[PDB]
Structures are given as C-alpha cells and as structure tokens.
Amino acid sequence: GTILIDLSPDDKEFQSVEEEMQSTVREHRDGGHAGGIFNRYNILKIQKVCNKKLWERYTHRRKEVSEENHNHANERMLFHGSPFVNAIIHKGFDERHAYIGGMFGAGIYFAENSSKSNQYVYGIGGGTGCPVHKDRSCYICHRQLLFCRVTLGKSFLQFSAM
C-alpha cells in the first residue's frame, strides 16, 4: 500500500522540509554522545509517504479529537527517529512503536528538535551506533528520519527538568 515519491531538490516542498531539519538542530547535554557531533546535516533525499489506508486512519481520528477539543485538532509537524522506520511507513504507528521507558509513559514520542530524534535512529540512546562502524557519530553511513503529521488535541502540559 505505501508509495514513496521522490521530491526534487528544486521543489519548494523539498526545501521547506530541509529547512525544518536544519533549523531545529541544537547542541545536546550529552555532548553528542548518543546522536553524534554536528551542527547541520547533508540532506540526500526527501520522499513523500503515500498510503491511502493509513492516511484515512489518521484523518478519521483527527476529526474525533478535533470534536472533543472545541474543534481544534492541534495538529503539528514533528520528527520521529526509530530503528523501525521501515515498518512505520508501511504499517503505521501502533503500540509496538511505544517507548516503555519514556519520560511521560509508554507512548509514541516526537520532537520539535530534529537532532533529538536523530539520537534514536540507531536505538535507545543511540544504541551501538551505525551497523557498519558501530559509530554513534558516523559521518559516512546514511541515516533516516520521519517528519510526521501529529494530532495533539488537548495536550497535558508537563514541566520536565529537560
């Protein structure tokens, strides 16, 4: 069911997605331990993920949330890093993508900072880094992130020491 459509670097949609990647890089208090040491990315490819079933699953729930929240879906665009990116794009998010040891309970986590989600592409805390070099700071191996459409509805505000 999933079709992946390559965007051209000359397409306006490619460029705005790259700029969201690049402008939300930050330094991390682990000094780069989990995600690597970098100030910016080399963006090699951006693909649009097309799946009619998954999309209608999303918009159906978005309408329920919106109607329980004074007609406000509170929809954001957020990053998500995971070793399971390939399962996600074909089958969608489910409870097997939930972070049990997460700071706000067993749910699915997203970040406004791209560099935060980058810390999880190779697993919890960066795992053992890239498969080829075991290097959490590998500058060679290609990585993948998801830029996701997310319905927050009425969101519970947690002030975490982060």
Binding site: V49, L54, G105, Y139, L152, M162
Partner: protein, 47 residues
C-alpha cells in the same frame, strides 16, 4: 500502551532547565500520527 491523562489526547514535555531545547510530545494512539516525509541524510562533521 498507557493512556493520556483523563480528558487529554497527548502530553507536551517542556524543558524547564535548558532554555534552548524545544518541546517533545507523546501520543498514546498510533492513528494520531501519519509518517508523511521520509528523510535520508548524513550528519556533518563540524569544520
């Protein structure tokens, strides 16, 4: 999976220490996110 707090649909985690960090968010239903863009990239070594 856990549930969002009663009457809520998600949790927003705001950094109360590092003024430079942005928010992180949690949802408890997978149908509340759609994986819209797949981005292939390398991190770049600082010059």
């Amino acid at each position: 999976m856990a549930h969002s707090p009663p009457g809520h649909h998600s949790v927003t985690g705001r950094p109360s220490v590092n003024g430079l960090a942005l928010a992180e968010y949690v949802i408890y239903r997978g149908e509340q996110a759609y994986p819209e863009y797949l981005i292939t990239y390398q991190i770049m070594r600082p010059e």
